[PDB]
Write a protein that holds these residues in place. Structure first.
Motif, PDB file in Angstrom:
ATOM      1  N   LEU E   7       0.813  -1.232   0.000  1.00 29.50           N
ATOM      2  CA  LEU E   7       0.000   0.000   0.000  1.00 29.50           C
ATOM      3  C   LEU E   7       0.848   1.284   0.000  1.00 29.50           C
ATOM      4  CD1 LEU E   7      -3.241   0.295  -0.028  1.00 29.50           C
ATOM      5  CD2 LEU E   7      -2.813   1.429   2.282  1.00 29.50           C
ATOM      6  N   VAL E  15      -5.677  -1.396  -7.237  1.00 30.63           N
ATOM      7  CA  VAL E  15      -6.242  -2.318  -6.251  1.00 30.63           C
ATOM      8  C   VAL E  15      -7.751  -2.489  -6.378  1.00 30.63           C
ATOM      9  CG1 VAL E  15      -4.443  -1.668  -4.641  1.00 30.63           C
ATOM     10  CG2 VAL E  15      -6.731  -0.692  -4.310  1.00 30.63           C
ATOM     11  N   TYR E  20      -8.885  -9.173  -2.280  1.00 31.78           N
ATOM     12  CA  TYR E  20      -7.856  -9.333  -1.245  1.00 31.78           C
ATOM     13  C   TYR E  20      -8.395 -10.250  -0.145  1.00 31.78           C
ATOM     14  CZ  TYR E  20      -5.012  -5.819  -3.540  1.00 31.78           C
ATOM     15  OH  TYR E  20      -4.218  -5.174  -4.436  1.00 31.78           O
ATOM     16  N   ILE E  23      -5.207  -9.038   5.209  1.00 31.96           N
ATOM     17  CA  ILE E  23      -4.562  -7.739   5.397  1.00 31.96           C
ATOM     18  C   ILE E  23      -3.454  -7.917   6.410  1.00 31.96           C
ATOM     19  CG2 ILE E  23      -4.849  -5.314   5.987  1.00 31.96           C
ATOM     20  CD1 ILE E  23      -6.416  -6.442   3.501  1.00 31.96           C
ATOM     21  N   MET E  66      -2.755  -7.616   1.172  1.00 31.82           N
ATOM     22  CA  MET E  66      -2.307  -6.221   1.157  1.00 31.82           C
ATOM     23  C   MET E  66      -1.517  -5.899   2.417  1.00 31.82           C
ATOM     24  SD  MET E  66      -1.862  -3.411  -0.394  1.00 31.82           S
ATOM     25  CE  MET E  66      -3.320  -3.232  -1.772  1.00 31.82           C
ATOM     26  N   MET E  68      -0.269  -3.141   4.629  1.00 34.26           N
ATOM     27  CA  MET E  68      -0.588  -1.756   4.964  1.00 34.26           C
ATOM     28  C   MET E  68       0.678  -0.974   5.297  1.00 34.26           C
ATOM     29  SD  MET E  68      -3.963  -1.579   4.592  1.00 34.26           S
ATOM     30  CE  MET E  68      -4.520   0.194   5.553  1.00 34.26           C
TER      31      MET E  68
ATOM     32  N   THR F  30      -3.976   7.917   4.997  1.00 34.97           N
ATOM     33  CA  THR F  30      -4.007   6.744   4.111  1.00 34.97           C
ATOM     34  C   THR F  30      -5.333   6.789   3.341  1.00 34.97           C
ATOM     35  OG1 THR F  30      -2.730   5.578   5.764  1.00 34.97           O
ATOM     36  CG2 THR F  30      -3.792   4.237   4.030  1.00 34.97           C
ATOM     37  N   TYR F  39      -1.763   6.075  -2.201  1.00 36.93           N
ATOM     38  CA  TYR F  39      -2.542   6.113  -0.981  1.00 36.93           C
ATOM     39  C   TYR F  39      -1.844   6.990   0.079  1.00 36.93           C
ATOM     40  CZ  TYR F  39      -6.190   2.505  -1.822  1.00 36.93           C
ATOM     41  OH  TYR F  39      -7.267   1.789  -2.273  1.00 36.93           O
ATOM     42  N   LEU F  40      -0.513   7.058   0.032  1.00 36.00           N
ATOM     43  CA  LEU F  40       0.266   7.857   1.016  1.00 36.00           C
ATOM     44  C   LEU F  40       0.671   9.249   0.539  1.00 36.00           C
ATOM     45  CD1 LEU F  40       2.419   5.200   2.798  1.00 36.00           C
ATOM     46  CD2 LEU F  40       0.377   6.212   3.579  1.00 36.00           C
ATOM     47  N   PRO F  84     -11.474   0.722  -0.365  1.00 39.87           N
ATOM     48  CA  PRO F  84     -10.490  -0.188   0.186  1.00 39.87           C
ATOM     49  C   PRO F  84      -9.233   0.511   0.705  1.00 39.87           C
ATOM     50  CG  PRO F  84     -10.565  -0.380  -2.156  1.00 39.87           C
ATOM     51  CD  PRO F  84     -11.747   0.401  -1.764  1.00 39.87           C
ATOM     52  N   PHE F  85      -8.857   0.136   1.911  1.00 37.73           N
ATOM     53  CA  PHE F  85      -7.629   0.551   2.565  1.00 37.73           C
ATOM     54  C   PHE F  85      -7.569   2.036   2.974  1.00 37.73           C
ATOM     55  CE2 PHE F  85      -6.571  -2.577  -0.898  1.00 37.73           C
ATOM     56  CZ  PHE F  85      -6.728  -3.690  -0.104  1.00 37.73           C
TER      57      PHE F  85
END
Ligand SMILES: [Ca+2]
Ligand SMILES: [Ca+2]
Ligand SMILES: [Ca+2]
Ligand SMILES: [Ca+2]
Ligand SMILES: [Ca+2]
Ligand SMILES: [Ca+2]
Ligand SMILES: [Ca+2]
Ligand SMILES: [Cl-]
Ligand SMILES: [Cl-]
Ligand SMILES: [Cl-]
Ligand SMILES: [Cl-]
Ligand SMILES: [Cl-]
Ligand SMILES: [Cl-]
Ligand SMILES: [Cl-]
Ligand SMILES: [Zn+2]
Ligand SMILES: [Zn+2]
Ligand SMILES: [Zn+2]
Ligand SMILES: [Zn+2]
Ligand SMILES: [Zn+2]
Ligand SMILES: [Zn+2]
Ligand SMILES: [Zn+2]
Ligand SMILES: [Zn+2]
Ligand SMILES: [Zn+2]
Ligand SMILES: [Zn+2]
Ligand SMILES: [Zn+2]
Ligand SMILES: [Zn+2]
Lengths: 253, 254, 253, 253, 253, 253
Positions: E7, E15, E20, E23, E66, E68, F30, F39-40, F84-85
């Motif tokens: 990620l 994604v 998925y 995690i 995934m 993180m 995130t 994402y970051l 997601p995430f």
């Protein structure tokens, strides 16, 4: 006195058979306002403005809003807590309060709240995001009453951040008995020594003990009741429109 | 009439900044239906008005100067009350956070003596006070319900008189006659528990408002008068004034 | 020893096939009681009283109650925390404990709980209110064992607030091996210098370091086992009756 | 009965003139233990071990330790909370409890505490770390009594995790009146279907509802008082040695 | 760079259309590691191991996981918080973080999480227990990466607790550019003066200010990239196998 | 790679003998950023800008600042949590994290902190207020990097609120390897049904699930690396100046 829209004077007999569409929560502070304005200015002003906006939305569109009693617990700056009877409220305390209010309103069937703040130190965005997830069906909006309409053309003083011309004029309009303008100091204010902070590159709270003399920020001397009356009219009109639209529309359609 | 010297709700920094204050009074109420006829803020209004009157008496009589703070409208309520429109239940932790913030501020300001004057019997402050006693060992906090300073028995006729009843109605009629239309009152009929020992008070359970009450009142307020209220508050005011003076003039133990 | 109604000595094999109607939570304190009474007095006494009431309720009506292990975490006054092995428990800590107890008991299918306190410093009304909203089908009552029947007329000592004639007599009755009356001090106590507080116009906690000499409040010297026996009999009977009614009636009907 | 080192039976008169070097806090659980063992096993066992160890340190060295009352509030696994009278305590509740205990002992002048646990589900390292920053002059150590000496070679059963041969044998030794072994189930347990969790590549709590029948983990059949007496003798000696060293040495020298 | 399973470099586009199964949350610390290793060692190592393990599980079994971004907030010991830029995280702060992560992942439909810790001072068993009650359909497992395969066998140094031969070797394998072995000190460490604590009868945290000179615990100077490569190979394989089993099996079947 | 001012790559050996004047805390999120951006993004951008400003401050004035690892825990809007995430962080969780960072930095002797946010959902004024009373000698300032300089004349797109032309350009500049512009969606957004909320009479959070299609707000397609390079130059220069003024002046002089 209006028992239909102002909880501060209302009773169950008057409200129990009426339908209410939007709840309004005035949120202020217990805070010194220069030497002349009430400690409860940030509660009183949004309360009186909210009641008028509620009256207009009812007479204009038949949208009925309840104005809750104002919350006197505001977030303050370094130097203010040491002034007598200024109450600093932690963010978590404020959040606990809003949580308890929203929980109860939700049980009662209400689904639309507007927080009408009279204190610029209060920030509600984080609280609102967190409650959006707990109560996905409960709309909460937030505004400062003094940011609804620009003060340009309404007031002469250029610096007017706290207990200045606008607050004093609006107080003189709603409650002339609560303010003697002759008692006001000049509200002289001093900038930071770090130029970038004055240029707003970054934010640091103003320290009241270094930055102010009488606790005001801005000269209130040209304040009048008539100026206050004129300024609040478009504020009330725009707020009434928001109440109407919150009542009449889903957030997204 | 308006008193900026002892009533913070109408006061300003200019009036207070050169004066010495001895005791702080915190009225603590509730936002709560009171039968059909009394204000939602009855439990804030009544202790505020009593405390200002007692502050004025202590000042004129002894030169002891107290500040009455704005009333706290956040009460602890019972089952069945939260569903009544605009009634706001406050969790004990929320109340404690409030009192923590008030005491922290007052302590920084140099104050060391506080009375919490409650208008709502659902509020309980003994635990908060115990916990704050250890955090601020130099800060004296007392608590009282205004309606326990003098017993209502003798001053009123109705025998059942727990909520929005004869006594609360009378005292509102005295202080704010414009806020109460007695003709709007219900009888405040109440229903006891089906568990006898709880009616006898062997143990305590909260009354369920939805089961126990019809109009949200507990007690018939209909023989209420302004004069009954006036007479009852006289001794309450005088006793509170006395407590304010002794709090100002003595340490807790000597 | 009774495994049927006392969890302190029980095991899963004894209880798993039985129905229980009411749970009883004895809640005390770890606290000096003059020089002679156990630190755990406030746990021990409501536990023993509760077990006898539970036994009576079962024999008399077939109502079966479980007495849980006592909570030794009490709320104390200024001056008490400094005495060796006195454990002050914050209200929030106590609330956390009761939340965990109620959460577990609720998952187990129980819906009726009495908190039977041995320490007057403990206050549970706030907790009970908040849990009422969290678990609306869960009845929680609270009582101090020593308020079930007034001690006036059971005991001679005029002042008897903590570790005095009443508590000592009841300990002498239930556990004479844990008390030697000869070791008691007089339990002399000093009042406040603010008259209105002694008159109880307002409430402030007693400061033990200023108000007491030996940690006691009241002279215990006239205490006897027989006085304790006589005093607990109607307390046990009244509590048994409460248990029975809680098992047999809804809160309202 | 030892009022010198056991608070559960002690009084202020017996303790107030004596110097105490180490405080010992037994920490258990309220938890079913197969069909045969007490709900309070995890409190009783560390309590009795600690009292015996405190009596040894005092007689052989003159080091005086006070054994506080056991904390009956443990952290439990999925499936346990639904068994009657099992009480799951959140970590935050446990931490609130220890903070209150340490804050009181600290004011009393105590500086050295051992948490002697009887429940494997309890974890105190995070609490201890946090309290080391709040009270840097206050030493807190933690141990499980059943890890002071490995059970290998003292007991026959290979699986012995909860209410098994060791705990049963130790209860048979200290409190043979509170346990009847003939009432025990076989304490059969089922592994996870995720092989790597059985191999301990990663940790997941055991689910009691899926993994046990009678609530025990491990067959207690071969338990005896003899075996219990034999196993605790070295535990009691090791802990007595630790009390002595905590009393006589700084953490680092 | 792998946007499929990492990620830290991925984007929604890559994604959003993929399934998925598990995690992986790397959880590290911001902590001095002798003189030579990065402050973020405890984030970097489990991150890199998890990514490689996820890649192996994907290639080998088609199980997609995934990884993180790493949590840089670890729990630390007395004497470490005074070292420049070491950030001590309270247990409650870590729990609040994990609660937020789990609440979001649960809403997204995920039901399986592995916490891969790089810091031994982190402890998640309690948090996992409390969350199992709140989210009963959400499996959370926890492992320290360096406990998946014991390092004894793979490295020479006798002591290797923090920033020693193992962490140094593994960092030289994954990121040789972030470590100059020539800068390392010897990582000499002093034991307690309480014998029983060194023998582990009870646990007390090491005090870094008393116990270490360069902040390391273990001599790292025989560290090599090849040794690190050798050690991570079987760790990466075991973890890949756990991810595949987590994806393919219920906890119990 | 700069071990002197970037903690994410630094080690104790590089920093332990250097004086640091100001600490910079990048605080991100995130969060999905259209289809194409990482994402970051909200962590990476303020991190890289802070490091450049720290280098400039040091080279130009000898003022030395440490850039801490970015905090990846942002406050998000309804609709974002379900992507997601995306990890929504409660205000209280964020405040617990800042409380921990400041507590550690204060112990270490630091008295000046700038929080440089990459995420407009983050609001720090309340936390900063509350910490000013806790740590009156510790200055905390907050800025959004994207508000230091107006985008007028730097970018073409009119709407550019999230993952639009400015963020996309700045990422193309600092990390072209992490963004493929060809993958981007149009970032189309939809307003509220409540006109007064679009007019900003009051604030409600945008619901991502109703207001966006690709998670972006603003067309990024005219982004270039050279636009990003040009834009960050004055941002870096103004921040460098703030760091210097923070190091060299008291807040009020
Ligand atoms: Ca000044
Ligand atoms: Ca309009
Ligand atoms: Ca008097
Ligand atoms: Ca009866
Ligand atoms: Ca495998
Ligand atoms: Ca959509
Ligand atoms: Ca500049
Ligand atoms: Cl201040
Ligand atoms: Cl400000
Ligand atoms: Cl009640
Ligand atoms: Cl008391
Ligand atoms: Cl387990
Ligand atoms: Cl350690
Ligand atoms: Cl928004
Ligand atoms: Zn104002
Ligand atoms: Zn204000
Ligand atoms: Zn009332
Ligand atoms: Zn009331
Ligand atoms: Zn007692
Ligand atoms: Zn007691
Ligand atoms: Zn056990
Ligand atoms: Zn156990
Ligand atoms: Zn490490
Ligand atoms: Zn580490
Ligand atoms: Zn962004
Ligand atoms: Zn963002």
């Amino acid at each position: 006195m209006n028992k239909e829209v102002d909880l501060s004077v209302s009773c169950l007999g008057k409200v129990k058979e009426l339908k209410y569409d939007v709840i309004i929560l005035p949120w202020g502070a217990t805070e010194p306002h220069n030497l002349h304005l009430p400690y409860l200015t940030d509660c009183i002003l949004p309360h009186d403005i909210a009641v008028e906006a509620a009256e207009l939305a009812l007479s204009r569109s038949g949208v009925r809003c309840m104005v809750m009693p104002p919350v006197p617990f505001g977030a303050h700056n370094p130097g203010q807590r040491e002034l007598p009877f200024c109450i600093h409220t932690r963010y978590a305390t404020q959040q606990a309060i809003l949580e308890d209010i929203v929980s109860s309103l939700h049980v009662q069937g209400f689904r639309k709240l507007l927080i009408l703040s009279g204190h610029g130190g209060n920030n509600f965005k984080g609280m609102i995001r967190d409650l959006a997830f707990e109560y996905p069906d409960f709309l909460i909006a937030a505004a400062n009453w003094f940011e609804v309409v620009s003060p340009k053309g309404y007031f002469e003083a250029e610096i007017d951040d706290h207990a200045g011309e606008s607050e004093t004029s609006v107080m003189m309009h709603y409650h002339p008995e609560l303010v003697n303008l002759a008692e006001a100091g000049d509200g002289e204010s001093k900038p930071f020594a770090i130029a970038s902070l004055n240029e707003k590159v970054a934010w640091v709270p103003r320290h009241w003990d270094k930055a102010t003399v009488d606790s005001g920020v801005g000269n209130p001397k040209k304040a009048t009741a008539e100026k206050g009356e004129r300024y609040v009219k478009p504020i009330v009109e725009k707020l009434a429109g928001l109440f109407e639209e919150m009542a009449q529309h889903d957030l997204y359609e």
